[PDB]
PDB file of C-alpha atoms and ligand atoms in Angstrom:
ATOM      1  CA  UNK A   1      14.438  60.532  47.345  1.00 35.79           C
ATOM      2  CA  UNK A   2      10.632  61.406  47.539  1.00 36.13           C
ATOM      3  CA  UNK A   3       8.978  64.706  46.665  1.00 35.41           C
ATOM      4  CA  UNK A   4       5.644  65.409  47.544  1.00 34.24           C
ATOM      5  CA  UNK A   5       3.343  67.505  45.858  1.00 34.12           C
ATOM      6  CA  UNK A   6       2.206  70.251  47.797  1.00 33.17           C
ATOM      7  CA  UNK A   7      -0.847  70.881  45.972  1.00 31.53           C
ATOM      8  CA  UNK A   8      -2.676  67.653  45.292  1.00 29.66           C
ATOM      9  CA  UNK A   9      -0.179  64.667  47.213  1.00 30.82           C
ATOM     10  CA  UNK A  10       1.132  63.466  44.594  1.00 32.19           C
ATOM     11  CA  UNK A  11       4.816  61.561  45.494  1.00 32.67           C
ATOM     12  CA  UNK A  12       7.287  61.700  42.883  1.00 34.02           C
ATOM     13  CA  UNK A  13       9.240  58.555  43.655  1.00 33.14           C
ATOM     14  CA  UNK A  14      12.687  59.308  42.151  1.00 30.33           C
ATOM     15  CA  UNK A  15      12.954  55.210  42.114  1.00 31.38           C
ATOM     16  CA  UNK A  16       9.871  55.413  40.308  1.00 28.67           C
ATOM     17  CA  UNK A  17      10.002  58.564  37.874  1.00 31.79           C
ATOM     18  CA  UNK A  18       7.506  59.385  35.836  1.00 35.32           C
ATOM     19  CA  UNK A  19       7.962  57.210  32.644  1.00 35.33           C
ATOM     20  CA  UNK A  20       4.528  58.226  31.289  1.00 39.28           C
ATOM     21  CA  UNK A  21       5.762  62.095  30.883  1.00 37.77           C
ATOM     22  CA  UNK A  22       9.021  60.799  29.353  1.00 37.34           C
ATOM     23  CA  UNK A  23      10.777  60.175  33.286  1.00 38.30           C
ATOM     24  CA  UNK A  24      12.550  57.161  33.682  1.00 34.54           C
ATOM     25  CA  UNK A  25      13.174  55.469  36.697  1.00 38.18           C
ATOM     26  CA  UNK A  26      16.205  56.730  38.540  1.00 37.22           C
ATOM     27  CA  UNK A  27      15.547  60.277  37.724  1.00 37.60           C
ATOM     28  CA  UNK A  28      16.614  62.843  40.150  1.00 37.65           C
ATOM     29  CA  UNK A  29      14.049  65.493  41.015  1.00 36.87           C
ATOM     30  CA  UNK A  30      16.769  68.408  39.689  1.00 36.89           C
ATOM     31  CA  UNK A  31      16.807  66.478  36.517  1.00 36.29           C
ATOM     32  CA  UNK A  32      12.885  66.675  35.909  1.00 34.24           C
ATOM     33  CA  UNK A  33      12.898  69.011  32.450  1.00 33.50           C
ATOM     34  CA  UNK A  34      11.800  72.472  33.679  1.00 35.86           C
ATOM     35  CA  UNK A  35       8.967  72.288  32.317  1.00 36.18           C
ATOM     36  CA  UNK A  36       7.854  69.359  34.093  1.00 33.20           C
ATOM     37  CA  UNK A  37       4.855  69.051  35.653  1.00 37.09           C
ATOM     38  CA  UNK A  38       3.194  66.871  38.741  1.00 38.56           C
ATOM     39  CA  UNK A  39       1.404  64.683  36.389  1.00 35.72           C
ATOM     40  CA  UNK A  40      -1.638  64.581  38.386  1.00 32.96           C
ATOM     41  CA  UNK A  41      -2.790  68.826  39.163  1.00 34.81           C
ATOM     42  CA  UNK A  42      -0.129  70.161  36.713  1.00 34.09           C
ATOM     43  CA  UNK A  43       1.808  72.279  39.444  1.00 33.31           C
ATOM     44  CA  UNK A  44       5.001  73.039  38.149  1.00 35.29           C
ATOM     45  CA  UNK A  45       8.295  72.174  40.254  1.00 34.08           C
ATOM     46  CA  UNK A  46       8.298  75.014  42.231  1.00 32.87           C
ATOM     47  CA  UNK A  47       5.464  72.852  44.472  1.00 31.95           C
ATOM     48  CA  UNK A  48       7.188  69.980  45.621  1.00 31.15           C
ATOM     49  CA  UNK A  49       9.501  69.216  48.828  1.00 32.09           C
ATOM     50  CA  UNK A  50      11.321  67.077  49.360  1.00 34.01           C
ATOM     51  CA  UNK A  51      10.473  64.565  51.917  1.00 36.44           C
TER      52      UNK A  51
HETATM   53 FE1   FE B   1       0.199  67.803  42.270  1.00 36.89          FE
END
């Protein structure tokens, strides 16, 4: 699945993750640490949909 970012746009790609912050690829959105960020305008989870 795909979440979007409601802030900035940012797609986290749950086939991508987010290996750069310590997400590997495969990583279900729940999974994200809580205090996970969008790596691009730092909004915290509470931002995204999902798509
Ligand atoms: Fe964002």
């Amino acid at each position: 699945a795909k979440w979007v970012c409601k802030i900035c746009g940012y797609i986290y790609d749950e086939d991508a993750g987010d290996p750069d912050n310590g997400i590997s690829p495969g990583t279900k959105f729940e999974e994200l640490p809580d205090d996970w960020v969008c790596p691009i305008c730092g909004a915290p989870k509470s931002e995204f949909e999902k798509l």
